[PDB]
Design an enzyme around this catalytic site. Structure first.
Site, PDB file in Angstrom:
ATOM      1  N   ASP A 145       0.843  -1.048  -0.304  1.00 14.91           N
ATOM      2  CA  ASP A 145       0.074   0.067  -0.250  1.00 14.91           C
ATOM      3  C   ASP A 145       0.901   1.252  -0.119  1.00 14.91           C
ATOM      4  OD1 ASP A 145      -2.738  -0.957  -0.091  1.00 14.91           O
ATOM      5  OD2 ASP A 145      -2.362  -1.998   1.780  1.00 14.91           O
ATOM      6  N   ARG A 152     -17.340  -1.981 -18.267  1.00 14.92           N
ATOM      7  CA  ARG A 152     -16.969  -3.236 -17.467  1.00 14.92           C
ATOM      8  C   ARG A 152     -16.314  -2.719 -16.276  1.00 14.92           C
ATOM      9  NH1 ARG A 152     -19.323  -7.189 -20.976  1.00 14.92           N
ATOM     10  NH2 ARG A 152     -20.692  -5.723 -21.943  1.00 14.92           N
ATOM     11  N   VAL A 182      -4.944 -10.892  -6.254  1.00 14.61           N
ATOM     12  CA  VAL A 182      -3.929 -11.069  -7.317  1.00 14.61           C
ATOM     13  C   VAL A 182      -2.692 -10.188  -6.659  1.00 14.61           C
ATOM     14  CG1 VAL A 182      -3.251 -10.861  -9.605  1.00 14.61           C
ATOM     15  CG2 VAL A 182      -5.725 -11.049  -9.027  1.00 14.61           C
ATOM     16  N   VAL A 214      19.464   0.343 -20.388  1.00 14.03           N
ATOM     17  CA  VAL A 214      19.783  -0.653 -19.560  1.00 14.03           C
ATOM     18  C   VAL A 214      20.832  -0.806 -18.624  1.00 14.03           C
ATOM     19  CG1 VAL A 214      18.351  -1.907 -21.313  1.00 14.03           C
ATOM     20  CG2 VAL A 214      20.771  -2.407 -21.247  1.00 14.03           C
TER      21      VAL A 214
HETATM   22  N1  LIG Z   1      -3.062  -1.891  18.444  1.00 10.92           N
HETATM   23  C1  LIG Z   1      -2.762  -2.287  17.231  1.00 10.92           C
HETATM   24  N2  LIG Z   1      -3.235  -1.690  16.129  1.00 10.92           N
HETATM   25  C2  LIG Z   1      -3.017  -2.169  14.956  1.00 10.92           C
HETATM   26  N3  LIG Z   1      -2.786  -3.530  14.672  1.00 10.92           N
HETATM   27  C3  LIG Z   1      -2.367  -4.472  15.597  1.00 10.92           C
HETATM   28  C4  LIG Z   1      -2.355  -3.851  16.983  1.00 10.92           C
HETATM   29  N4  LIG Z   1      -2.088  -4.789  17.996  1.00 10.92           N
HETATM   30  C5  LIG Z   1      -1.774  -5.981  17.106  1.00 10.92           C
HETATM   31  N5  LIG Z   1      -2.119  -5.592  15.620  1.00 10.92           N
HETATM   32  C6  LIG Z   1      -1.916  -6.944  14.993  1.00 10.92           C
HETATM   33  O1  LIG Z   1      -2.107  -6.234  13.450  1.00 10.92           O
HETATM   34  C7  LIG Z   1      -3.047  -6.896  12.938  1.00 10.92           C
HETATM   35  C8  LIG Z   1      -4.370  -6.013  11.952  1.00 10.92           C
HETATM   36  O2  LIG Z   1      -3.856  -5.871  10.344  1.00 10.92           O
HETATM   37  P1  LIG Z   1      -3.248  -5.009   9.952  1.00 10.92           P
HETATM   38  O3  LIG Z   1      -3.571  -3.645  10.041  1.00 10.92           O
HETATM   39  O4  LIG Z   1      -1.909  -5.116  11.057  1.00 10.92           O
HETATM   40  O5  LIG Z   1      -2.278  -5.212   8.669  1.00 10.92           O
HETATM   41  P2  LIG Z   1      -0.899  -4.537   8.158  1.00 10.92           P
HETATM   42  O6  LIG Z   1      -0.076  -3.641   9.107  1.00 10.92           O
HETATM   43  O7  LIG Z   1       0.011  -5.836   7.805  1.00 10.92           O
HETATM   44  C9  LIG Z   1      -1.426  -3.760   6.639  1.00 10.92           C
HETATM   45  P3  LIG Z   1      -2.120  -2.273   6.848  1.00 10.92           P
HETATM   46  O8  LIG Z   1      -1.244  -1.495   7.972  1.00 10.92           O
HETATM   47  O9  LIG Z   1      -2.266  -1.649   5.795  1.00 10.92           O
HETATM   48  O10 LIG Z   1      -3.222  -2.348   7.604  1.00 10.92           O
HETATM   49  C10 LIG Z   1      -3.945  -7.748  13.917  1.00 10.92           C
HETATM   50  O11 LIG Z   1      -4.183  -8.846  13.291  1.00 10.92           O
HETATM   51  C11 LIG Z   1      -2.954  -7.717  15.031  1.00 10.92           C
HETATM   52  O12 LIG Z   1      -2.138  -8.982  15.397  1.00 10.92           O
END
Ligand SMILES: Nc1ncnc2c1ncn2[C@@H]1O[C@H](COP(=O)(O)OP(=O)(O)CP(=O)(O)O)[C@@H](O)[C@H]1O
Ligand SMILES: Nc1ncnc2c1ncn2[C@@H]1O[C@H](COP(=O)(O)OP(=O)(O)CP(=O)(O)O)[C@@H](O)[C@H]1O
Lengths: 731, 731, 141
Positions: A151, A277, A284, A515
């Site tokens: 992201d 569409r 993916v 390249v």
């Molecule tokens: N207070 C907190 N706030 C956010 N995430 C936490 C947290 N404490 C633990 N986590 C962990 O992070 C996971 C949440 O999904 P998450 O937001 O972490 O995805 P990510 O960091 O890999 C991608 P993104 O940051 O774009 O959401 C939870 O399953 C949890 O185990």
């Protein structure tokens, strides 16, 4: 002393390269390293979710999407009850060094855990753990994060492991889909990821020259419905046989209301009646194989992370490893987590320029550049100079040249210049192959491989009189060159020819495209990421071979000339065992040493070998010589095959890094040209616009001479040489 | 006389290869050929939607999805008023031969138009056209169709142009996705095309070893909900870190009620509580670049279509060109259009075995094989022999070997054998690298490149005593070998060694696997479609680069040994200008003649060249020699680059053709083994199971000796040599 | 090879700054005349440089040297004597043989007997007299 590494959150391509870099570098610095399976969940469950790692465990992992050790979303870890049980398990195995590879949330979690690490005092107040061990293993919880997320969420970091790869998926889809928008002039609304982040949407859009994009950071503002529809009808008048609209998952208007892709279709089907569409790409984008950039990026930060942990002391705050300006930095973890929420808060509070400013300057450069080349003010409103600016391609073809040309043209027109396209490099120049070129002429170029204008290596030195004649005939007020070392040489020649030909007393700027990445004045060149990706793909297939046969070593020759960028970087990304290059001498001791290593390696289970040779790295030690040495010395042990890839390494369509790099740096060069023409000749008006460490800079060709090895056409100080020890470590 | 070609209906990858084949072959037979843009619509509109085609018009088209000449759906063509106006425009240009590239409806349309031709008599009764020209251009409307569709809809044809390509898109997605499923232990429901046809669903499922599939031809039958859920829980017990469920768009239960992918998710989220996503693939499946198989297929039928038109007489009924059993056939158009509706009628009337039987035997073979390897009867119900069957890999690695091994193992276990996996070919055999292997051990292999058990070229001849010792030690009752010429040679050696070693007096069968396709007793080998795609992929990227200057000829060396299959077929698919092979001698006159052709070719606008050299096609005329000749003799005109593709041609991941070919033929071989062991030694128990014209057959190695060139390890009579005149025609 | 290269390096600190290396044409599959030329060229880089020559088919000769003429003359006459003596006593192994020089004197050896004394795969004999001289080259250098 003992390091634990886990992978939390929406997985990202390159996560595996990172775990490999941490396990290998950890072991290399003589530490033990523990896997923690299933992200924070494994840490909460304990027991056999925590398991020691050896060298062999992280091979065959590098070239593979997702995490070979799992990502759980972990609800339990959001609760004191969970975090106590996690901390307990770490103490059970003495793990107080933690490497956490994840996203916003994963790192918010680790920041919270770190602050709370006197949950230990709860442990003692129960049976949990011995009183004296609340002080042995105390607030020497040493946390280091790396952001693995497609992201580009996190604030500290310029880039996140996964993004380049995800953008590869998106563009693979987008390129594939463009051929089916001819079965009727279809409009395709593609819905990309970025839940509360517009980066992946923005970059995709720019990379495929999309007709419209929707980002949450920067909403459309009222009346866009009609303005978009004007665009898409104007496009049928231009005779464009499709439309492509990129919609972030979390797109919103200025009131924070969802703009859904199904909403967009209804607007287009309704107002215009075009056949429409909607593709929801979905997961993916988390899948497929890790790009060369993510493999390398993840590899560099796996290593910095391990250094950051061992260098840390109970004073040092938890940090997040980042590449900012192609230099690995440590950033305080608390502050970066804070800043990222702030961005959500800015959007939530309808403060949209603030969200964009807080995203970083990079974000805004993409957004601004995109607008400029997507929306065309009517001729009425773009007044401006009677200046004529030329655009040319010099050097051998490089993927992205076309994107670059399209950008130069539109920004020039937008700036109210008249754009002349010169064909076939200085050949066509000398012969007067010059024609006026407009906005629509360059449509659909952003992803075209090769050079449509045409490119030649031939230098202008013997055609100064003729070329000067063309500038006079066409009244050429300035020149942009997109090319490699031959362009650079070309500017030097013309710089020197000024005093005899008035016509060359104009602003001349060059952006680097090959390249080879051998252009002095730039750490990167348009075309090299494409090449690295084809090399990377190829070595992957090669190792797969070596692996089925077993006890086999492949010696593979690569391009670059005397520039070992493709060889070196290609080596890293393919996880080779060695990459010989011209800029690092090697003798028969160096070769014998690598041969003896590989020999020992065939006593383990990973009985394969991969050796890369830059094509011009040594007069005497040829690809055959190396092949003959290793063949012979391995005689009881392994055998070899030589492959000379040759010019198929170029690859085809440019990779997104190259399209966007092409697009962004060319527009920046044209801005320079207009600003210069606006103050209306010395060294400062003939320069190379290039990427140098943190920021882009224009460097007079005069200054670059002393920084240039003219005899091997490579620069003298090359940034990526500092990475040489990694290959051997990470092998 | 004059030929017109149009592209109607839902577009398919390979439609462009077909138009090229019709235009070139039409011209070659000395006909004039007209494009009809925008399907039937162009024909109705007339004027400039009909445009004469020359040689140059169909270049740069071959490697491109969709139709370079449009597909309109055309309402007007459903009305007498439209068809009159169409017929009129054809007569205006003397077009009375029509080639229609489309689907069910397109072809139903052309059959109708044909019957109604002498709508001409209406034309005369008005001003339309001269009275005497109603008899010159009369019911010598000669119609021929080719089926361009991803669905494999049509009944006559075994295959439709677009299917292989679409299955490529699907499997590219499915492979990409598996990575993020591991990570989170997710269940992914993927929804694929096939509105009223289950072929694309079925083949995908088989190709990615999917855990469940849904076809409209063959519904689940009552109680599947529970049976599926048993499968997916059994899969967590096996520790499988994902699940993949393939759902046709038009899936139904036994009552003709939609089984939606969102319906499946609710069932899985509900009953089991596994984390579950749904991807709707959509129009990606019609897009991307045409596989080598579709390029070649479409090219062969473009040609047959032109022959069919000129050979036709006013007696001969309109036909549909088809490849059935690798031989081009003409099928009456009326009957095939009929039969395809019949299949809808069967499903509509809840007659499901009838829909499957009407789909062809191929369809039912895929379905049967899929079930066997997807659903495992509990040990209780699979009683059977105390026989131990071994599986080995011999030869150099070939993509699909793994798929093949997984199939052998499961069908053996299913047949109640005990399966021994032998490692590293006859190397590991001689050294006793043998271990029992089960159902779960081979899970997730269907799409693994290379060979996990391991392959060696080394032959058993000098290790008969040792190898026989291993069979005695492990009580090996039979053997299946997946490999190339080295396997075949291996069976001959062991056949001869029977009389000295009793242990070899067992049933031994071999299925052919090599990129080379040089195995006697089979028209096809597991791994060659992958290699053809790598070759085809590579040339595409090559042509994509270097663009404006052109005047360049690439000489490209391919594998095969002395077997010119990759080279020849690769040549076709890549649209090369020449492909030199060992089975067709060539002298310096031949080369000089090709060089002089390419010279003339650089006076046209298509100033590029592509020359393929089989790696052992000539002792003296090496890739360098050819590169030196062409370089030198083009000196005023063009220049060259040589590339030696090398070991990538083995592949990354196997193509779907190779996976399914691997899976299907290996299972068929195991069946043979069990049947043989059940009647419990002569020539008939040592054979090669291979594809010969229409059907698969077991051929004793005794019989294949006389059909084998031992000295160049290629067979003597090779089916694809009949295609040699195409390359030159189509160039 | 590395040890010979280091020797020659030291040799270029004396006054005899030349080098001569001979390579039997099939002495090694992988270590070719080019390989050896590339090694020595490269490792002598601060010190000496190289040239490769492949003598080739002149080694057959112009006119034969006297040793060869007389050897040709003397052993052939001796072989013909044998033939006439044999024909005079007028078939087993002893009538098909190689007349050759073995240590002090010439002898006829049935081809049957020579098979076990022959490396057929490299077409050289198994025990070769001149190998006892190998230490000289290094000594006398
Ligand atoms: N207070 C907190 N706030 C956010 N995430 C936490 C947290 N404490 C633990 N986590 C962990 O992070 C996971 C949440 O999904 P998450 O937001 O972490 O995805 P990510 O960091 O890999 C991608 P993104 O940051 O774009 O959401 C939870 O399953 C949890 O185990
Ligand atoms: N009976 C008929 N008479 C005239 N035109 C017809 C026709 N049936 C089909 N067509 C033509 O073909 C189109 C309608 O069905 P269509 O061609 O779209 O199915 P198809 O052949 O493209 C794919 P499928 O295999 O899924 O049926 C219209 O554009 C019309 O021009």
């Amino acid at each position: 002393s003992a390091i634990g590494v886990l992978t939390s959150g929406g997985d990202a391509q390159g996560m595996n390269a990172a775990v490999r870099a941490v396990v290998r570098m950890g072991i290399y610095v003589g530490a033990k390293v523990y896997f923690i399976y299933e992200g924070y969940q494994g840490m909460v469950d304990g027991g056999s979710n925590i398991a020691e790692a050896d060298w062999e465990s992280v091979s065959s992992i590098l070239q593979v999407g997702g995490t070979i050790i799992g990502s759980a979303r972990c609800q339990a870890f959001r609760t004191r009850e969970g975090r106590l049980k996690a901390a307990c398990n770490l103490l059970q195995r003495g793990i107080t060094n933690l490497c956490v590879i994840g996203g916003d949330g994963s790192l918010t979690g680790a920041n919270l855990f770190r602050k709370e690490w006197s949950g230990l005092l709860e442990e003692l107040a129960r049976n949990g753990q011995i009183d004296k061990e609340a002080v042995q293993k105390y607030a020497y919880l040493n946390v280091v994060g790396m952001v693995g997320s497609i992201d580009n969420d996190f604030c500290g970091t310029d880039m996140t492991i996964g993004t380049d790869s995800a953008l590869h998926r998106i563009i693979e889809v987008v390129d594939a889909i463009m051929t089916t928008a001819q079965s009727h002039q279809r409009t395709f609304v593609l819905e990309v990821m970025g839940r509360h982040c517009g980066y992946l949407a923005l970059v995709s859009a720019l990379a495929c020259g999309a007709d419209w994009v929707f980002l949450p950071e920067s909403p459309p503002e009222e009346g866009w419905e009609e303005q978009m529809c004007v665009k898409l009808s104007e496009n049928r008048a231009r005779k464009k046989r499709l439309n492509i609209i990129i919609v972030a998952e979390g797109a919103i208007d200025t009131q924070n209301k969802p703009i859904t892709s199904e909403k967009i279709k209804e607007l287009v089907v309704t107002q215009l009646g075009y056949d429409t569409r909607v593709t929801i790409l979905g997961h993916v984008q988390r899948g497929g194989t890790p790009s060369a950039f993510d493999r390398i990026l993840a590899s560099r930060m796996g290593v910095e992370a391990v250094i950051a942990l061992l260098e840390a002391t109970p004073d040092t705050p938890a940090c997040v490893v980042s590449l900012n300006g192609n230099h690995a930095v440590r950033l305080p973890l608390m502050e970066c987590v804070q800043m990222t929420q702030d961005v959500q808060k800015a959007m939530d509070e309808r403060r949209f320029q603030d969200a964009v400013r807080l995203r970083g300057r990079s974000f805004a450069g993409n957004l601004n550049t995109y607008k400029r080349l997507a929306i065309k003010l009517p001729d009425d409103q773009i007044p401006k100079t009677n200046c004529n600016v030329a655009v040319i391609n010099v050097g051998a073809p490089a993927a992205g040249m076309n994107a670059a040309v399209r950008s130069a043209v539109r920004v020039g027109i937008a700036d109210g210049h008249r754009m002349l396209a010169i064909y076939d490099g200085f050949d066509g120049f000398a012969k007067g192959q010059i024609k006026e070129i407009g906005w629509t002429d360059v449509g659909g170029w952003t992803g075209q491989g090769g050079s449509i204008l045409g490119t030649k290596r031939v230098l202008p030195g013997k055609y100064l009189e003729e070329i000067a004649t063309q500038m006079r005939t066409h009244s050429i007020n300035a020149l942009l060159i997109i090319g490699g070392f031959e362009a650079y040489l070309g500017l030097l020649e013309l710089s020197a020819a000024r005093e005899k030909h008035e016509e060359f007393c104009v602003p001349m700027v060059m952006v680097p495209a090959t390249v080879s990445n051998n252009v002095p004045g730039s750490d990167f060149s348009i075309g090299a990421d494409t090449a690295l990706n084809t090399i990377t793909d190829t070595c992957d297939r090669i190792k797969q071979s070596a692996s089925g046969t077993k006890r086999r070593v492949f010696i593979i020759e690569t391009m670059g000339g005397y520039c070992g960028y493709l060889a070196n970087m290609g080596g890293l990304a393919a996880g080779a065992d060695a990459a010989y290059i011209f800029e690092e001498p090697f003798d028969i001791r160096d070769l014998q040493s690598n041969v003896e290593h590989l020999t020992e390696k065939m006593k383990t289970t990973i009985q394969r070998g991969l050796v890369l040779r830059n094509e011009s790295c040594s007069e005497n030690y040829t690809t055959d010589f190396i092949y003959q040495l290793y063949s012979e010395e391995g005689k009881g042990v392994f055998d070899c095959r030589k492959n000379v890839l040759g010019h198929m390494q170029q690859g085809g369509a440019p990779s997104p890094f190259d399209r966007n790099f092409g697009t962004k740096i060319s527009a920046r060069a044209m801005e320079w040209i207009t600003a210069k023409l606006k103050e209306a000749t010395t060294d400062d008006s003939i320069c190379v616009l290039g990427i140098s460490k943190r920021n882009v800079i224009f460097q007079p060709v005069a200054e670059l001479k002393k920084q240039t090895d003219f005899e091997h056409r490579i620069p003298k100080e090359q940034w990526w040489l500092k990475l040489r020890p990694l290959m051997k470590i990470l092998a």
